[PDB]
Design a protein around this motif. Structure first.
Motif, PDB file in Angstrom:
ATOM      1  N   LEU B  64      53.153 -13.349 -38.077  1.00 22.62           N
ATOM      2  CA  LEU B  64      53.128 -14.176 -36.880  1.00 22.62           C
ATOM      3  C   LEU B  64      53.927 -15.461 -37.060  1.00 22.62           C
ATOM      4  CD1 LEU B  64      49.430 -13.555 -36.035  1.00 22.62           C
ATOM      5  CD2 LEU B  64      51.208 -13.433 -34.280  1.00 22.62           C
ATOM      6  N   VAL B 123      37.305 -14.318 -28.139  1.00 18.47           N
ATOM      7  CA  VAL B 123      38.122 -13.108 -28.112  1.00 18.47           C
ATOM      8  C   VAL B 123      39.222 -13.200 -29.160  1.00 18.47           C
ATOM      9  CG1 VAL B 123      39.819 -11.876 -26.713  1.00 18.47           C
ATOM     10  CG2 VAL B 123      37.613 -12.464 -25.732  1.00 18.47           C
ATOM     11  N   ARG B 124      39.741 -14.400 -29.375  1.00 22.38           N
ATOM     12  CA  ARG B 124      40.900 -14.586 -30.235  1.00 22.38           C
ATOM     13  C   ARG B 124      40.569 -14.208 -31.678  1.00 22.38           C
ATOM     14  NH1 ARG B 124      45.231 -17.834 -29.199  1.00 22.38           N
ATOM     15  NH2 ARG B 124      44.319 -19.798 -28.476  1.00 22.38           N
ATOM     16  N   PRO B 125      41.424 -13.446 -32.356  1.00 19.12           N
ATOM     17  CA  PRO B 125      41.108 -13.010 -33.719  1.00 19.12           C
ATOM     18  C   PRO B 125      41.235 -14.143 -34.729  1.00 19.12           C
ATOM     19  CG  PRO B 125      43.288 -12.281 -33.119  1.00 19.12           C
ATOM     20  CD  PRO B 125      42.720 -12.920 -31.897  1.00 19.12           C
ATOM     21  N   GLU B 128      44.888 -14.791 -36.047  1.00 19.06           N
ATOM     22  CA  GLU B 128      45.737 -15.550 -35.141  1.00 19.06           C
ATOM     23  C   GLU B 128      45.169 -16.943 -34.890  1.00 19.06           C
ATOM     24  OE1 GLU B 128      45.555 -15.145 -30.389  1.00 19.06           O
ATOM     25  OE2 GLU B 128      46.823 -13.570 -31.201  1.00 19.06           O
TER      26      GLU B 128
ATOM     27  N   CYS D  14      57.180 -12.261 -29.070  1.00 18.59           N
ATOM     28  CA  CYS D  14      56.133 -11.467 -29.691  1.00 18.59           C
ATOM     29  C   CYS D  14      54.967 -11.377 -28.718  1.00 18.59           C
ATOM     30  CB  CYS D  14      55.689 -12.065 -31.031  1.00 18.59           C
ATOM     31  N   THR D  18      45.273  -9.255 -27.881  1.00 19.80           N
ATOM     32  CA  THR D  18      44.419 -10.375 -27.514  1.00 19.80           C
ATOM     33  C   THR D  18      45.201 -11.455 -26.779  1.00 19.80           C
ATOM     34  OG1 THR D  18      42.982  -9.894 -29.383  1.00 19.80           O
ATOM     35  CG2 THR D  18      42.841 -12.086 -28.398  1.00 19.80           C
ATOM     36  N   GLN D  19      46.450 -11.700 -27.179  1.00 15.36           N
ATOM     37  CA  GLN D  19      47.259 -12.701 -26.493  1.00 15.36           C
ATOM     38  C   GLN D  19      47.494 -12.314 -25.037  1.00 15.36           C
ATOM     39  OE1 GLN D  19      49.769 -14.115 -30.381  1.00 15.36           O
ATOM     40  NE2 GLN D  19      50.933 -13.878 -28.480  1.00 15.36           N
ATOM     41  N   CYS D  21      45.636 -10.292 -23.372  1.00 17.25           N
ATOM     42  CA  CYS D  21      44.330 -10.376 -22.724  1.00 17.25           C
ATOM     43  C   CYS D  21      44.031 -11.796 -22.260  1.00 17.25           C
ATOM     44  CB  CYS D  21      43.238  -9.893 -23.677  1.00 17.25           C
ATOM     45  SG  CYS D  21      41.562 -10.355 -23.177  1.00 17.25           S
ATOM     46  N   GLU D  22      44.368 -12.789 -23.081  1.00 20.25           N
ATOM     47  CA  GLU D  22      44.050 -14.170 -22.749  1.00 20.25           C
ATOM     48  C   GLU D  22      45.022 -14.776 -21.747  1.00 20.25           C
ATOM     49  N   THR D  54      51.132  -6.148 -34.276  1.00 20.72           N
ATOM     50  CA  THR D  54      52.087  -7.170 -33.878  1.00 20.72           C
ATOM     51  C   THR D  54      53.326  -6.493 -33.317  1.00 20.72           C
ATOM     52  OG1 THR D  54      51.323  -8.865 -35.429  1.00 20.72           O
ATOM     53  CG2 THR D  54      53.611  -8.987 -34.683  1.00 20.72           C
TER      54      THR D  54
END
Ligand SMILES: [K+]
Ligand SMILES: [K+]
Ligand SMILES: [K+]
Ligand SMILES: [K+]
Ligand SMILES: [K+]
Ligand SMILES: [K+]
Ligand SMILES: [Mg+2]
Lengths: 105, 161, 48, 59, 130, 125, 133, 74
Positions: B64, B123-125, B128, D14, D18-19, D21-22, D54
């Motif tokens: 990331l 919700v966010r892992p 990340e 990227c 979850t991203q 989703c949010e 990813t």
RNA sequence: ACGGAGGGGUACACCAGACGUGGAGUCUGCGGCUCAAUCUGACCAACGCGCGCACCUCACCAGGCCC
RNA sequence: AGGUCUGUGAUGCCCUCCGCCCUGGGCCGCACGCGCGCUACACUGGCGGGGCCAGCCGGCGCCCGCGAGGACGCGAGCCCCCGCCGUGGCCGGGACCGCGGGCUGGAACGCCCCCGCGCACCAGGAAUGUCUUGUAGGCGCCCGCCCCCACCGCG
């Protein structure tokens, strides 16, 4: 009304006709020989049917003896117990309490 | 946070080492830094042990950073470790200054803690969350939890000089 | 006159004293925990 | 709002499930509606795993 | 050979081949059954009998020399039973599904009986090898 | 005919070496896969045929015992020459654990607590 | 195309949840009984909830009021060998109140230890009760 | 053929016999353990005695008298 | 022996931390209350302690044999 | 003047002839306050399918049965991988209760399995305990008492 039969057709067909019915404790205890001191209970109860003070708490009740009054020991005294149709399938130790329920104080 | 306490050249292909790094006083100064972060990561209590999973956690937080900053992840890690960690502390509380190994210790600890608190019930892992924490500490941003904790410590140090 | 001990039950007791309580039956010892402390020297058990 | 997916989602170098989703309510629609952008390969995979994946923009 | 290929590849590539040539094909009791007393729900992937039997034969192949048995296969697929307010404990799986599998695998000459238990017969050993 | 050992907590890896199978499974496929770089370190930091049988212990201990058996068997074919005494120093200068076993073991539980050092909660009222 | 309510069996099914776990909304359905009632009647168990046709509801209802006929077994049922009809009933409606309450009134007429202890609102299943609730 | 099983609880005597039978011509150690409280009653700090009886066996295959040893041929 | 006396040492007692308990439901022991009986011992160093109470164990209650 | 005469054929002095046995009941009864614990409050998670590794030492084959378990004979969990759910007291959590089917035993009130029912609980005031390497914590396994049965203790 009992499982699917009315009182005439289990109390006159066969004494063991109900075993395909009532629960697994009943089938186990009846697929086992009843101790020779409660057969005397029936040849004193059903015999001379025309009030018994008893002392065997664990004894499966089966239909032929219905509408009776008994007095079962609970450790300090004998307690009267009546016999309504739904009592079939149970034991006699569920119908006389050996402890008075607690109250305030 | 000095060059003499952040170990760069001792790393391996994965952080797992089975090393007895805490048998002597200053031995961990030669402990690789990503493995130190990995060791801090599995510090929730229901996750004690479970290093094999934390190695994945950090491993997928380096794909990331390479996709956001476009730079080397280990370099941004060194930057975050250096930026965080109070330079002045308070211990009739008078001001004192902090040793290098303790600056590194508190830095790695607060990065792990910031991610840990930011991922719970969300919700966010957690990986990340670590990406956010690392990329934001290394810059200096007030949104970093380690930088705000550092600033609080330095303020209380100043008020007690 | 002929009812004395009709009840059937194990009456396991200690081989040395006679108590019913806290009998060790592992390995087939069948002796109680108070008597096991002092007769253990010759029975053979020793502390290491 | 499928048209948003077919262009608004395709603006980040990227993306994660979850991203996405949010950003907008894509709770599990994420997983379904990014595999579409993977079969026509506006985005591809670089690091995948059962728990995290990813996705980096081919463009 | 069998030992070489990633174990997760062979199992799910032979279970898809278990749909061809009228091999063990699943019976009817497959519905409304838990694979174990520790499971709390039934499997959701509908090909679960196929994959299960692929796995059990790949288990039989590795024990080429000696014999496995059914009760000791349910032990192989064991799981821990949760949600009881007491510490969790492990439970043996269901012997009916596994015995159903091995019965049909004794047909088609894929396995041969022994003194105690099934064994990988030369036919079926050749098949898995190929 | 080379015979070699490797030890971790309870794991024992027995290596037979002739001029790479782990428990008959190929090395490249040793299932704990995020640790696959560990079982291959001596190769990729320094062929022939070797046969490994590892028993006892757990996943990580077994990996670490084969990591020592493998590197110790490739030191029993070179002998009496400077390579024998220099490849050892190169191996240790990466990880001494590559040559010498880890002595640590489980300590015994003592009565009055669940573990070897943890005791039971004390109360006064 | 979907609906965001199935006001069925007087229970409001929300929709947008998985239908497997949507059926558990009805008191009487579990996830076990639901996963044995959908596949037994050719309905996809997990795609969504509000994409179930009218005919699919008809099939589900026809397998809900009669499980034995479609092959759902007795051991997977809840009113087994009832004390009203000697039959393996299937009480899957908000009219479970009547039978549960009849099993209390039968005890009230019979005067059993279970009934007398249930009257006082006490534990009935052998559990200790000295702990100060 | 012939078999001699020899069993004893004191390693020294067992070794002496085993030595002096070779002057004329798996069986591992298993430990009987008992843990019991030290007090006769149950008052005080709960401390425990650990008692242990270790036995030894040898199995001589064929084609001195000591009080304490046990020998059976079968 | 003790000291809100001085001096010299020391221990996971504190420091730096970790993991908790105390809050929920629940297993078990204790006190109280009830009871024909709810047998009894112990109040840092009592309270999952006196090695798993349907009978037995059993010391306690209601009755009943025998020397 | 902690404990233990209630472990003994250790035992003085007091008191009982309260000995031995059988049937049934109690020790487990419950407005309430305390000690040691167990299980949680979730995504660093729950579930479905697969892979594979211990030590204290240690039987399992074949048929029936969803399971629990029966009739008949002979010598590990965590973790990893692939999916599903999607911040919603939800698929977290599993107490309480309602039918059934079994095992032990002279006898369930004891324990197990199946379907259904889905409590309180969102990290916990004032206080308070333990711990420095294969250690804390997490995960399971075995033995003891034991007709049956561990949330216990020894490992
Ligand atoms: K010892
Ligand atoms: K949505
Ligand atoms: K859905
Ligand atoms: K004590
Ligand atoms: K205690
Ligand atoms: K005494
Ligand atoms: Mg009694």
């Amino acid at each position: 009304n009992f499982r699917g039969v009315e009182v005439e057709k289990l109390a006159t067909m066969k004494i063991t006709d109900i075993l395909p019915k009532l629960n697994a404790r009943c089938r186990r205890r009846i697929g086992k020989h009843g101790l020779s001191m409660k057969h005397l209970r029936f040849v004193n109860k059903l015999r001379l049917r025309r009030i018994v003070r008893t002392h065997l708490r664990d004894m499966i009740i089966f239909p032929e003896m219905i509408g009776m009054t008994v007095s079962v020991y609970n450790g300090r005294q004998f307690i009267p117990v009546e016999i309504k149709p739904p009592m079939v399938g149970r034991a006699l130790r569920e119908y006389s309490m050996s402890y008075k329920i607690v109250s305030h104080g | 946070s000095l060059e003499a306490y952040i170990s760069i050249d001792n790393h391996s292909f994965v952080p797992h080492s089975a090393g007895r790094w805490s048998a002597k006083r200053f031995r961990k100064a030669k402990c690789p830094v990503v493995e130190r972060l990995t060791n801090s990561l599995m510090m929730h209590g229901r996750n004690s042990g479970k290093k094999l999973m934390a190695m994945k956690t950090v491993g997928e937080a380096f794909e990331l950073i390479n996709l956001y900053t476009g730079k080397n992840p280990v370099q941004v890690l060194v930057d975050a470790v250096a930026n965080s960690g109070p330079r002045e502390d308070s211990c009739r509380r008078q001001s004192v200054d902090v040793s290098p190994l303790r600056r590194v210790n508190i830095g790695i600890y607060n990065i792990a803690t910031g991610a840990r608190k930011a991922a719970f019930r969300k919700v966010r892992p957690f990986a990340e969350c670590l990406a956010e924490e690392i990329m934001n500490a290394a810059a200096g941003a007030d949104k970093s939890y380690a930088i705000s904790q550092r600033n609080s410590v330095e303020r209380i140090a100043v008020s007690n000089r | 006159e002929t009812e004395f001990c009709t009840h059937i039950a194990h009456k396991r007791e200690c081989r040395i004293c006679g108590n019913y309580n806290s009998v060790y039956r592992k390995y087939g010892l069948f002796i109680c925990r108070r008597c096991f402390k002092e007769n253990a020297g010759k029975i053979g058990f020793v502390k290491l | 709002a499928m048209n948003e997916a077919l262009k608004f989602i395709k603006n980040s170098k990227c993306i994660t499930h979850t991203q996405i989703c949010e950003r907008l309510r894509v709770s599990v629609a994420l997983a379904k509606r990014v595999m579409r952008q993977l079969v026509k390969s506006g985005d591809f995979a670089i690091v995948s795993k059962s728990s995290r994946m990813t996705i980096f923009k081919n463009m | 050979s069998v030992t070489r290929v990633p174990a997760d590849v062979f199992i799910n590539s032979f279970a898809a081949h278990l749909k061809n040539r009228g091999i063990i094909k699943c019976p009817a009791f497959t519905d409304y059954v838990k694979t174990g007393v520790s499971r709390q729900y039934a499997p959701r992937d509908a090909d679960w009998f196929y994959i299960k039997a692929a796995s059990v034969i790949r288990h039989f192949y590795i024990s080429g020399s000696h014999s496995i048995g059914v009760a000791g296969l349910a032990r192989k697929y064991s799981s821990l039973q949760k949600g009881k307010t007491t510490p969790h404990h492990t439970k043996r799986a269901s012997c009916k599904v596994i015995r159903s599998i091995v019965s049909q695998f004794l047909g088609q000459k894929l396995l041969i009986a022994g003194e105690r238990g099934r064994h990988i017969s030369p036919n079926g050993r050749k098949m898995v090898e190929d | 005919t080379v015979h070699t050992l490797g030890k971790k907590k309870n794991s024992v890896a027995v290596a037979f070496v002739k001029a790479i199978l782990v428990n008959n499974v190929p090395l490249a496929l040793v299932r704990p896969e995020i640790l696959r770089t560990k079982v291959s370190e001596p190769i990729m930091i320094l062929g022939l045929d070797m046969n490994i049988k590892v028993a006892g212990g757990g996943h990580v201990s077994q990996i670490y015992a084969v990591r020592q058996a493998i590197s110790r068997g490739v030191l029993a074919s070179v002998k009496d020459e400077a390579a024998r005494s220099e490849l050892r120093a190169k191996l240790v200068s990466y990880d001494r654990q590559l040559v010498v076993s880890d002595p640590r073991r489980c300590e015994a539980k003592k009565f009055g607590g669940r573990g070897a050092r943890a005791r039971r909660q004390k109360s006064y009222r | 195309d979907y609906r965001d309510l199935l006001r069925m069996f007087n229970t409001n099914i929300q929709g947008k949840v998985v239908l497997e776990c949507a059926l558990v909304g009805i008191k009487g359905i579990g996830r076990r009984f639901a996963n044995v009632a959908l596949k037994k009647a050719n309905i996809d168990v997990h795609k969504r909830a509000g994409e179930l046709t009218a005919a699919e509801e008809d099939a589900l209802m026809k397998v809900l009021e009669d499980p034995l006929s479609h092959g759902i077994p007795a051991w997977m049922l809840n009113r087994n060998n009832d004390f009203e009809s000697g039959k393996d009933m299937h009480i899957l409606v908000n009219t479970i109140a009547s039978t549960h309450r009849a099993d209390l009134e039968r005890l009230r007429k019979t005067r059993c230890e279970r009934g007398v202890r249930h009257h006082h609102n006490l534990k009935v299943r052998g559990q200790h009760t000295k702990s100060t609730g | 053929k012939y078999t001699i099983i020899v069993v004893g609880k004191d390693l020294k005597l067992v070794e002496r016999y085993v030595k002096s039978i070779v002057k004329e011509g798996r069986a591992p150690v298993r430990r009987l353990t008992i843990t019991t409280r030290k007090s006769p009653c149950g008052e005080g700090t709960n401390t425990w005695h650990r008692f242990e009886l270790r036995m030894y066996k040898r199995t001589f295959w064929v084609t001195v008298v000591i009080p304490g040893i046990q020998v059976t041929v079968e």
